[PDB]
Structure formats: C-alpha cells, structure tokens
C-alpha cells in the first residue's frame, strides 16, 4: 500500500517520525509536505497529498500542520477526497469505518508523537464497513462541492498567491 | 457578538445546553436546527449557509464525532470548519485560520471541556496579516 | 476478567452506561457505588479498597474531571491510578505502570471515547520486566 | 515565583521547552528532572520536585514523563503535595481553582508542545478560590496518606532499587 | 540561483538547517536527499543531486552524509560533475576557485552546524577564476571517466540493489 | 599489511615522512611516486591503478588540499577515495565505505594529525554486511 | 570514575548526547552545565565543572559551548585545573598524555557529534605518562595564576554580574 | 593594525612564514620570539605580556598542538586565548570572546588553512554588547 504524506513547516519533525514508522511497517511513502522548516503554506501540501490519493498514485493520505485544521481542510477541498481531521483514535476509526475517509489530518503541535503514532495505526488498521446508511452520507458528502477543472491536477494553481507573497503583499 | 449553531440528532443535547449557556452570557444565538437535523450533512450545511449569508463570523456545529460536520461543511467553497477537541486549537484556529465554525463531537468531548473550547474560540479574533495567503488559497479551492 | 467500578454524583451516569457495556462483554463487574458516592474521595477510596482486597487487577473510577479520583486514590500506599483522556495512555499506563485503576472525567471525555479508552485499558497486560523497578519505587511511597 | 520541574528520559526535550518558556515568563526555575535522555526512573524526579514544593524551596511544581501518570503519581505520594495529572487545560484549571493542586503533571509524549504550553500557562494563571465544598475535599485528600519520616527529605529512599537495577535484577 | 541538495538518513537534520539557510539567503532549493531518517542509501541521493546539476536543473549541488565521503563520491561519479569533499572552509574555497567544483560534499555528523554554514557560504561566495594551470587540471578530471548511457538520466539505475535489499540479501 | 602511497609536488614532503613512518611500523610500502608527480591527477591515478591491480587494500594520496586527489581518483570505475582531515572519518570511511584510499591535504592537515588519521585508517577493516549495498552501487557508477 | 560536565545554552543538545554516552560507558556523571537552552553564560558552568574536579568530587571534566573557547577558558581559570581546548582527537590525546589535562573543552557547534564522541573517548582512554620534561611544563602551568580565596568554592562569585544582567546593564 | 606573535621550537617555522605573510600585507608585526622560545609556556607568556602591555588587540601563538599555549596563557588574569583549528571559531572567538590571541598547533593545522584562520581572526572585531558580561566574568577569574 502507498501512503502520501504532507505537512507545513511547523510539524516537519513529527512528519519525519510518522514517515519512519510507516516505512518500518512496510508501507511505501510518497512525501509531498514540506521538507525543511522554512515558513511555507499548508494548502500547497494538502493539495498535493489530496491529488496523489484522488489520482490513484497513493491509497491513502496523511496531512499535518500545527493544529491540522488548515492542511486537512485544504485536502478536503479536492475532488475524490474525504479528509478526516482527527486528534484522537476514536474519531479516526469512525472516519475510516463509517465515512471511508481517505485522508487523515492531525495536529502535530497539539498531539504528542506517541499518540500521533496510535492515531495513524488505528486509522490504517480500520476498514470501511459499508451500509445503506453511511453510503448515503458519503454520497452526499461527495456531491457538495462543484468540480473545478482549473484546480484539478493543476500544479500552478497557487502561483498567483505565491507571487504576491514573494512581492511582500502578505506582510504583517 | 452573534453565534450560529446547529446539530444533528447526536449533538442536539449538547447544542441545547450550549444555547442556554450562550444566552445566559449575553450572546445572541441563531439556532438553525430548533429540531435535530436529519444528519450532520444537513446540520453542517445549514450552519454554513446561514453563516456565509449573515454578518456573524462564528459558528458551532454539534454531532457525535465532529469529523463529519467538518468534512461536509469544508466542501463548500469559502467555508473553513475546525473540528476542535482541545484548548489550543480552540483559539489557534481562530487566530490563524479565521475558522468560520468549529465542530464538536459529543461522543468525544465532555461538556465542561466543550464550554472552555467554545469560550476560547469566541474570544479569539483572526490575526490576518501573513495568514491571509493561506485563507486566500483555501477560498480558491472547491 | 474482573473489573471494579465506582463513581460520585458527576460520574454516576457514565458509570451506569459502562457497567451495562462491561456486562454485555462478559465481564464480572463489582460496583462499589450502586448509588452515587458523596464525593470523588469516597468513591475513589471505595474502589481502591475493593481492588487492593480483591483478585481483580482492573478498575475504573468516574467523576467530573478524573483528576480528583486519581489525586485522592494515589495517596493510598500501593495504589496506582491513572487519569486517562486519550487512547495512548489507555494502554501504556497498563503496560508500563500496571495501573491498578483508571479515572475518567465525565465533563472532559465523551462516552464513545471513554469506551475505547476503557477497552484498550482492559485489553492490556502489565509488561513487568524492567518496569518493575518503577512500580517497586511507587509501592514504597506513602 | 519559583517553579520546580522534573521529568524522565522520554520527555527531556519537552521539559527543556517548558523550562525555556517559564524563564521567558519571569519565573525562577529549579530543574530536578533528568538532564539527558539516558534511561532512568520517573519516581526519582517526581519525589525531588514534590519535596522542593513541600519544603518551601519552590512555590509550584511541574512533572512530566511519557504519559505523565508515573511521575505525577510519584509526586502525589509525598507529604504536603496535591499532584494533578492534566493533559488538558480544562482539568488543569479545575485542579488549581478547586483542589489547590501544587504539582502539575503532563504527558510529554501524548500532548503536543503547543498544548503543553497552554496547559502550563492556564495552570499558573489560575488561582485557588476556597469554598466550603473544596475546602472539605482538600482536607480529606491531605489526610489519606500516613506520613513516613523515612521517606520525608531522604534522597537515598530509592537506593536499594537503584542498586538492584545496577546489578541487573530488573532485566526484560 | 538554484541549489540542489541531498543527504542520507544520518544527517537529515543538518540538511534541513542548510535548506532553511539557503532559502533565507534567497536561493531556490531542490531537495532530493532523503526526507526522513529511515535507513537508506547515500548513492541514491548523490546521483539525484548530480543529475540536477549536470542537466541544468540546478546551478550547484550540496550533498551530505555522516562523513560526506559516500554521497560526495557518488555525486562525483556522474557525467559533468566535479564533486569536492570539503569539511573545511579553506579547501571548499579552493574547490570552487581552482577546480570549479559544482557539487559540495560535507560530513554532517563530523562537522558542527555553525561550521557547515560557514563552509556552504564560503563555497557559494567563491567564484571560479580560470588559469592555464587549473584549466588543464579540470580538463583532465573531466576526461577520466567513461560515459555510460545506461546510468545517465536513469532513475532506475540502482533498482537491482534495492530489490536485493528488500529481499534481505544485505543482512549483517 | 600493504599500503600504496603517492603524491604530487605539494604532498611529496609529507609523503616521504609517512613512508618512513610506515616502514618503521612493519608495513610493506609501494611508492608510486619516488619523485613528485606532475600534478594530483597523475599521482592519484597512479595510486589507483597500482591499488586496483595489487593485493593491497589500503592507500594514501598526498597533495595540497586532498580534494583534488579524491575528485580525480573517484572518477575511476570501482575506486573509492576519501578526503580525510579528522579522526572520525579516518576509521568510519574504512568501516562503512571500505575506502580504497584516503587523501590528505598537506596545506590543511598537520603532520601529527595526519599520522593519527593514517593509523586509524590502516587499523580499521571494512565491516561489509549491510554496507555492501552502498559499495555495490558505487562500483556500478562511472 | 566520575565525570563532571557543563555547557552553555548553544550546545545543550550535544551535551545530552555525550552525557548519554558516558553513562552507557559506565561513567558516573555530574551534570553542572545549563539544563535547557535559555540564554545564559558559559563562565558559570565552566567554574562549576572546574571546582568539581579540583575539589575531588569528579575525576575529570568536560565543558562545551559553541566554539568551546569561552567555557574551556573559564574552566582553566581555576585552581588545580589544566583545561585543554580540543576540537580534534590528536591534541586531546596529547593534552592527557603530556599535560595531564583534567578538563576537556569542545566546540559543540563546530564539531559534529560523531567526532565529539571520538574526542571524548580518546581523551578518556589516554593516560598521563609522566616524564621529567612534561612534569616541568605542568608545574610551570600550575604556578602561573595567583590563587584568589574569594573565587575558590564561592558560589556567589558572579552574583554581581548576574544582577547587572537582570538590570539590563548588558544590553545590545 | 598591529599583531603580536611568538613561538616555541615547534611553531617557529610557521611563525616565520606567517611573519613574512603579515609584513607583505601591510601588517605591523611585533615578534617577541626572534629565536624560538624554550617552550610554549615561555612563548605564550611572552606574547601575553607584550599584548596586555601594548595598544594591539590581536596576537598569534605558535606551537605544536595549540592546546599548550592556550592552557598556559589563559592562566594569566585578564588574558583570553583561543586554540583555533577551523574557520568558524577563527572569527566567532573574536566576535564573541574578543580573544586577545589565538593559538595554532603546527602539528595539527596545515599552513594554507592557518592563513585563512589568521585572516578571519584579524578581520573580525569584538561585538561587545551582551557578550561583555561573559568577558567581565572571565577577567574576574585568576
Ligand atoms: O495549524 C496551522 C494551520 O492550520 C499552522 O501550522 C499554520 O497556521 C502555521 O503556523 C503558519 O505558519 P507561520 O506563518 O510561520 O506562523
Ligand atoms: O509514561 C511513562 C511513565 O508513566 C514513561 O515515561 C515510562 O514508562 C518510560 O517509558 C520508562 O522508560 P523505558 O524503561 O526506556 O521504556
Ligand atoms: O558517512 C556515511 C557514508 O559515507 C554514513 O552516512 C553511512 O555509512 C550511513 O551510516 C549508512 O547507514 P546505516 O546503514 O544505518 O549505518
Ligand atoms: O562559543 C561560545 C563562547 O565561547 C558561545 O557558545 C557563546 O558566545 C554564546 O553564543 C553566547 O550566547 P548568546 O548571548 O545567545 O549568543
């Protein structure tokens, strides 16, 4: 199985710990998230991981940022994805078993590494158990957003914002 | 300040408790689910619709696990929903993400903790500045 | 397997639910508080006494925050109580600390999460070995 | 104000982060916990921190280990101490306001640093507010354990166990 | 300017520090080296960085491993590359000024980060100054190896070894 | 044990000293540059040829900076040369890389330190095992 | 054998690695250097380590700071001490064998951890080999400084400077 | 700028080389050991005496290992001597420690590296500011 993983600069160290664990467990990893700790933007990596899963390059995805909210939301805003923001084992298992979530989000700065490892393992070990009830929920979720061909598989999608950033448009 | 709230059958009980809490604390509440919604998709979308179509910038969604309401509402263009289970994200998601709503899972988070989470969320404003690039990126997505 | 349970007024409701859960899963349950205890000191000490005198090696204390039941029961010589609110400690405290009991705060932890925490605690055995030195040290203290 | 802090080898890095923060906040810190990451035993440092607080050398104490259970339990098992194991802000504030807890325990491997910082800050910012209700709870707690002069202020209390460890008695 | 960087698992943390610095200095970075700290093989990343430089995707390359010997040697064994193994500023400047080295190798576990930063900065600040003497040395170096089309731009070049590793052929 | 040595004009003086050192310590030395080589490319390649054709598995190249001899000799298929200027790499490159030769820069490394580096290199054997995959990879390259 | 170790905030992580190693090697360690990474002053820890050795509480001492210069110099400026600043194995062995140095200084930010470990091990493994020649050198070294009773074993020796620091006297 | 230099028998050769270098680069040099000193204690103390009794703020001591000259000269009240073997300390010790002198071991550091180290040391000034507290502490010691 192939797991795509991504992150922003706040949790690169936690991502490394999970990447190591996944490989020890026999999983093939596609690391998309940022590779160092230089200030960057979570949507970039959330989108890359989302597309790996949606396009079939990876079976599932894991995304992390400080709280996990930003990157998991970015991952959710993509075709074919159901991203579950889970800082606990219980909801992560529910997300996989009931909502067949294919992207797991975790807050690497709010959850300790031992618990992150537990959440990931529980999410991966869980299996989607289809029922007429959850299939209806999933279908509704899959039909909320309106597909945008300009975003789908477009690597230059955020070039506009990145330029403005390089031009100091987003100063404090 | 105004607060938009909603819940499915699983989060209804806590929603009612929080509603009374907020009202007893000078908060103006807009309950979009006087009766429990069919499910978390209906409740989360109802809260999202009322929010994006109002002058309020804070909302609370209640369901069993939180994950569902966020997963569904985040599919709406321009919406940003944060599942919250602890007290750091409660304020950080507002400060950095300008979270338009937080989702609380009643089967995950106890009531006393929920109130602290809610208060921290309501008492925190969006910092803007450099964080706007990330919000601009999210709003651009489906 | 045997399990000892107890609770004060705030933890009683969840305690009753867990009791039903344990019975349904073939667990021999000893409820030291058929009626809510006066406070968490009374309930936690009752659970401790029953435990340290029974053949059971698993116990669950219920109160509003968990903190109190653990703070009180840990004052008893030989007792080791772990406040648990997440799924890693649920098993690690049993594996490493051989926790004689766990304390769940009903105002902190939701029911569905409490059940996962409880099942992980009950399913894990103390590892012994090198960890025994720490338990010997704790046992030695007041 | 003086804060005594301690930890076992699993969370020395988290202890360092909190120590740094406490000093930046203006607190005087007495670091007792282990200083490196060599395998050691949580009761040793929990007892050291507990006595600093109980003897008046420190106003409050903070102890951490993987889950916090071991070191906070060790701290609690000392005269004059009310140790509260809190992996969340809500119960930490309750611990200070209602139980006048003077030692805070946290699981450094299950709670993320940003949340650890929030728990510590909330605990310290909180103030004990006496009421007939909590006064009675605190009195009960303070009278459960039977004082042992051989343990009080005896840094050699665990020497027998330490010798057994050095002699390989505690092998896996 | 574009800098390609790579590393093995022993020095990922040092690579991250240098990546951060390069970006703060205004350089565009192409991180090829390993992204986590899971046991891997230095030739893989040395070859990746070498080709980025040789194919014009990057202006210069920086590779690091425990001692730097393995990854810098791997980088050197590619068409168009002149890799210099330098754990000091003096030889790094010589490497750039006299040998027009386009790949810098450093031992991330034997050189401290502050000195690594100084070596990188000195290497980058230096400029090749052609002379009849070094022109002849460089020409000789560029003509020692016999080009192998099967290796050039072939990312699957080490697949046979990787399979043997997965099959446990390389056990201790 | 056998050792192959070579040097250009800048590394000749130290080379001569080391030769005396090796002879005094019962080492069979093969000096491929009784007279200084034209440049480090000539000396390093001479050492490489002699080595890859001899039964010896240890070699030392001398020049002003070390960098050049390694950069040149490493272009030879199958050759592995380590520039060494400190005492850890001195043994680790032999243990892990099975370095066929080390290169010492006379303008970088002092004589006393060079001797310690050399003795550590000569005293360490290639560990093989898992490290062989990396050597197989290097051997495969041009 | 007992080894006293100290450091400033720049190299606390490197000190931890060496402390761990020393304990694995069977040495008893007295950690004096700073315990976190909060800005502090190297002379404080250099003096503490020096006195442990000079007073017989420790057999030898190891001190580290960014470059090692500051803390090793501070250690050297104490009665009964011969501190050797060594970023290499060769001079460290010379320091122990010829000058019977009893305090080793290392630059934790300029020397990589693997090499630091090698320097420490080589220094500790080496043995002083007395000769009429080095005894004369050592005696001369031991008689250069003039003993000051106000510094010797005085824990409040730097209180004056510390107060001025707390009063912002040493601003940038 | 002025530079004070000195050396024992082991560092004499390099000292002479550096002296010519410095003079050929517009540097005014004060050689306190025209003939090699008896040992590094005599040479390092001679350089220290001349420095503390002059308007120059930079000096270079030469011996076999560097360690000795620093160990001896640092015993003098107010003196600060840095053994230097690499290019980062070369400037950092001047910037932070205001090192009054650096010590170079000729058996450790090659000549070309020594020149880079020396130039970096000579081209760097003491930053003062917050670092003064540490220099005040050192000067207070014996
Ligand atoms: O949780 C999140 C996003 O949900 C954080 O990871 C993110 O907001 C980062 O803090 C942004 O980085 P910086 O601009 O250096 O503060
Ligand atoms: O949570 C805890 C204790 O409550 C852990 O810190 C503790 O059990 C350590 O893991 C013990 O150390 P080790 O023997 O190397 O596994
Ligand atoms: O210096 C080097 C290579 O020149 C080291 O980075 C390298 O040999 C690694 O140690 C290999 O990794 P491992 O098999 O886990 O020991
Ligand atoms: O090498 C040294 C001292 O020889 C450095 O460890 C020391 O100068 C520290 O950098 C001082 O700390 P800071 O004031 O935060 O820059």
Numbering used by the authors:
A (entry chain D), D (entry chain B), E (entry chain B), G (entry chain D): 1 to 172
B (entry chain C), C (entry chain A), F (entry chain A), H (entry chain C): 1 to 142
Which lines from the publication concern this structure?
The crystal structures of LacAB and its complex with D-tagatose-6-phosphate revealed that LacAB is a homotetramer of LacA and LacB subunits, with a structure similar to that of ribose-5-phosphate isomerase (Rpi). Structurally, LacAB belongs to the RpiB/LacAB superfamily, having a Rossmann-like αβα sandwich fold as has been identified in pentose phosphate isomerase and hexose phosphate isomerase. One active site is distinctly located at the interface between LacA and LacB, whereas two active sites are present in RpiB.
To obtain the LacAB-product complex, the crystals were soaked with tagatose-6-phosphate; X-ray data were collected at 1.65 Å resolution. The active site pocket was confirmed by the electron density of Tag6P in a wide-mouthed trapezoid-shaped cavity, 10 Å deep, between LacA and LacB. In contrast to the two substrate-binding sites of the RpiB homodimer, only one active site was verified in the LacAB monomer based on the Tag6P electron density map. The binding of Tag6P in the complex is stabilized by many hydrogen bonds with hydrophilic residues in the active site pocket. The phosphate group of Tag6P is bound by bidentate or tridentate hydrogen bonds to the guanidinium group of three arginine residues (Arg-130 and Arg-134 in LacA and Arg-39 in LacB) at average distances of 2.9, 2.8, and 3.0 Å, respectively. Additionally, the phosphate group of Tag6P, which is O6-linked to C6 of D-tagatose, forms a 3-Å polar interaction with the side chain of His-9 (LacB). The O3 hydroxyl group of Tag6P interacts with the carboxyl group of Asp-8 (LacB) and the main chain of Gly-66 (LacB), while the O4 hydroxyl group interacts with the imidazole group of His-96 (LacA). The terminal O1 hydroxyl group interacts with the side chain of Cys-65 (LacB) and the amide nitrogen of Gly-70 (LacB) at distances of 3.3 and 2.8 Å, respectively. The O2 carbonyl interacts with the amide nitrogen of Thr-67 (LacB) at 2.9 Å.
